Design a binder for this molecule. Structure first.
Ligand SMILES: [Ca+2]
Ligand SMILES: [Ca+2]
Ligand SMILES: [Cl-]
Ligand SMILES: [Zn+2]
Length: 129
């Protein structure tokens, strides 16, 4: 049974790597909560943009907050074929207090180097009682 909901705002990314022949990249972000079988969330694609701003908000059913971890994956949408990874990071749900607007800045890495940019996110945890 779920014990709370976390509110994730994907704010912006800064300093992404060029991944297209021209235009930079077409970034979007995939957000997955660990220990879960729900479809991951994806932001809008920000075509031809190496400093995209989304300010996009998602929410996730928390089952246990010291265990579960948020996975943020930044991909470059392709006109042909599948999007190509641009970097990822994780963020632990133990890193917050309920009812407080907490921001973070995650560095993008190949897996959990060459500066791959930053992803700014905000989290707000709210439990039931
Ligand atoms: Ca590309
Ligand atoms: Ca692309
Ligand atoms: Cl679009
Ligand atoms: Zn589009």
């Amino acid at each position: 049974r779920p014990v709370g909901i976390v509110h994730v705002k994907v704010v912006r990314a800064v300093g992404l790597r060029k991944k297209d022949l021209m235009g930079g990249a077409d970034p979007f972000v995939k957000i997955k909560l660990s220990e879960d079988k729900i479809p991951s969330k994806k932001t809008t694609v920000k075509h031809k943009n190496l400093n995209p701003e989304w300010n996009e908000e998602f929410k996730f059913s928390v089952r246990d907050p010291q265990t579960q971890v948020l996975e943020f994956s930044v991909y470059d949408w392709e006109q042909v074929g599948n999007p190509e990874k641009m970097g990822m990071n994780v963020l632990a749900l133990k890193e917050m207090v309920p009812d407080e607007h907490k921001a973070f800045t995650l560095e993008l890495r190949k897996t959990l180097d060459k500066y791959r940019g930053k992803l700014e996110v905000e989290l707000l945890y709210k439990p039931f009682t």
